[PDB]
């Protein structure tokens, strides 16, 4: 008969200085934080892509409802929420003839055709950027379904260009980093799901009951990619820096050459949540080893500390290094050798390969979210997925599987660690959801590491997320 402890929801902040718990309700009651004036858009694609994009933009100017208004709060229209103008008047079409797209996608070599498609698109986008007086904020790339399907490494067709990826998305996002154009990739079947069907007269992607959720997430992503700040945290304390750390294999290379990346979150003393990547890919030449060398470990820690210091002027009082791996001793000693005296380094391992499933005795509903089972002073379980009593449902479908959290190195309180981890799940600007199942410091670092791995021609890449997500 072990005991469970429950942790309250952290709450997120909005305009008027108003704190709520759900992002959707807090965008439809007080609106976003910063004040833009409108989003001018660029569209690259075929004529049908412009048609579909115009249709969707015109559609989402009116309120959209869902089937269930408790589980999924309504969408009251784009301008009624975001206090800005985004219609089919500030568009700038760049027609791409279907002849070239069809001609390229028949070469039977995935890398070659991926390279050709990415070059074809980015040449037009860069030419539009540099040599014209038009100001366009978010470049929307409408891509046909067949291009998306046939752009995988394990795809089938029914040396100079081999140092790349086989994916349209990763190469496209990597090759435009040095020019910094915020782009958004759409599929044709996503914006117009009615037309794209199967041999049954019904759409393949059925959004009939969840149109409002699709509008919410698309509008939120567009608002964030255009210099918008929709919400921020509420009670993340001063003097604390949160760091992520993820390892990515570079795959196509002579050496195994594991790479590593990071993310940084903290408070800027102006109540703003500074949140950006701190990445210059550090490489481990050893196969299968997921540990930094002392040199690169020192370099990474020094870069993070210097960024924090130049941001605020004072070194952090507490530092948290989150990861999915376990540090060895040399890595942590290298960490410690370049650390100031008035600063605490704490490392945490967040794992998901640990089977512990709890079942309610009577009902047909799963366990509450905030429940946590403390094992030791340095080990616990946390349920980031579970029943939320405000939306009358859960975040998953089957019985969920909790995160296993251990304080690997340092001295701290496990309750505060779980509280901060739960608070770090309300920052998924890529989505509009109640909360995340894993902390955001470990998911955006993953996206950065996946983006800046397909290319090897990149130096000093930017830190803002708007060019990766």
């Amino acid at each position: 008969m072990k005991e469970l402890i429950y942790i309250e929801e952290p709450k997120i902040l909005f305009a008027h200085g108003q704190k709520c718990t759900d992002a959707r309700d807090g965008l439809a009651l007080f609106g976003p934080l910063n004040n833009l004036y409108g989003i001018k858009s660029g569209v690259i694609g075929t004529k049908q892509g412009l048609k579909i994009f115009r249709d969707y933009l015109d559609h989402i100017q009116k309120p959209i409802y869902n089937s269930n208004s408790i589980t999924r709060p309504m969408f009251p229209g784009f301008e009624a929420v975001f206090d800005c103008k985004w219609e089919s008047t500030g568009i700038t079409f760049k027609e791409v003839t279907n002849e070239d797209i069809g001609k390229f996608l028949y070469n039977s070599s995935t890398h070659k055709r991926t390279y050709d498609l990415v070059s074809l698109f980015i040449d037009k986008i860069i030419s539009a950027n540099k040599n014209e007086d038009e100001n366009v904020d978010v470049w929307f790339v409408i891509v046909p379904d067949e291009i998306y399907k046939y752009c995988r490494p394990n795809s089938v067709l029914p040396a100079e260009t081999y140092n790349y990826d086989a994916q349209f998305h990763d190469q496209f996002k990597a090759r435009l980093l040095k020019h910094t154009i915020p782009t958004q990739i759409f599929r044709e079947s996503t914006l117009a799901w009615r037309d794209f069907k199967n041999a049954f007269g019904l759409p393949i992607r059925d959004f009939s009951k969840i149109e409002g959720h699709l509008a919410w997430t698309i509008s939120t992503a567009a608002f964030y990619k255009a210099g918008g700040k929709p919400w921020k945290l509420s009670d993340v304390r001063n003097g604390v820096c949160y760091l992520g750390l993820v390892y990515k294999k570079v795959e196509k290379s002579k050496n195994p050459r594991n790479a590593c990346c990071a993310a940084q979150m903290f408070l800027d003393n102006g109540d703003g949540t500074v949140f950006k990547g701190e990445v210059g890919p550090w490489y481990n030449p050893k196969n299968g080893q997921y540990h930094l060398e002392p040199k690169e470990a020192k370099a990474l820690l020094s870069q993070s500390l210097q960024s924090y210091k130049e941001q605020i002027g004072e070194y952090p009082k507490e530092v948290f290094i989150h990861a999915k791996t376990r540090f060895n001793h040399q890595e942590w000693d290298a960490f410690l050798e370049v650390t100031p005296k008035e600063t605490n380094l704490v490392g945490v391992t967040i794992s998901k390969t640990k089977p512990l499933k709890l079942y309610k005795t009577e009902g047909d509903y799963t366990i509450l979210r905030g429940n946590a089972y403390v094992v030791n002073e340095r080990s616990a379980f946390l349920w980031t997925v579970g029943y939320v009593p405000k939306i009358q449902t859960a975040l998953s479908m089957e019985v969920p599987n909790p995160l296993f959290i251990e304080i690997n190195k340092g001295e701290a309180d496990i309750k505060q660690v779980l509280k901060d981890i739960l608070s770090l799940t309300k920052l998924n600007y890529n989505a509009c959801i109640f909360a995340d199942g894993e902390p955001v410091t470990l998911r955006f670092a993953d996206k950065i590491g996946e983006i800046l791995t397909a290319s090897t021609d990149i130096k000093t890449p930017p830190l803002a997320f708007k060019y990766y997500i």
Partner: protein, 100 residues
Amino acid sequence: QLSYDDINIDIVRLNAIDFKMSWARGLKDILEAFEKQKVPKEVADASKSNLLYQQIFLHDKSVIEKEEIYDSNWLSILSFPEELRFHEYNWMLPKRFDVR
């Protein structure tokens, strides 16, 4: 920032609805009071005014303190033998016997 004393004397004795900590539970109290005191609401928009009325009164839902008991998929081992033994078959078993 203003205390009880500084309140206008003509209004301090009246029941007041509080917006200090949020504007949403204050609106919940407003709707409760209005529907209790029979204010003439003329619903002109259907399926919209009701949904907005429902969005408040549910944003503030939370958990209740009731004892709960859960099962799991862990079975606790009860008993163990008292001796782990290392027997010594010095070249007394085949070198490639495949003990398993």
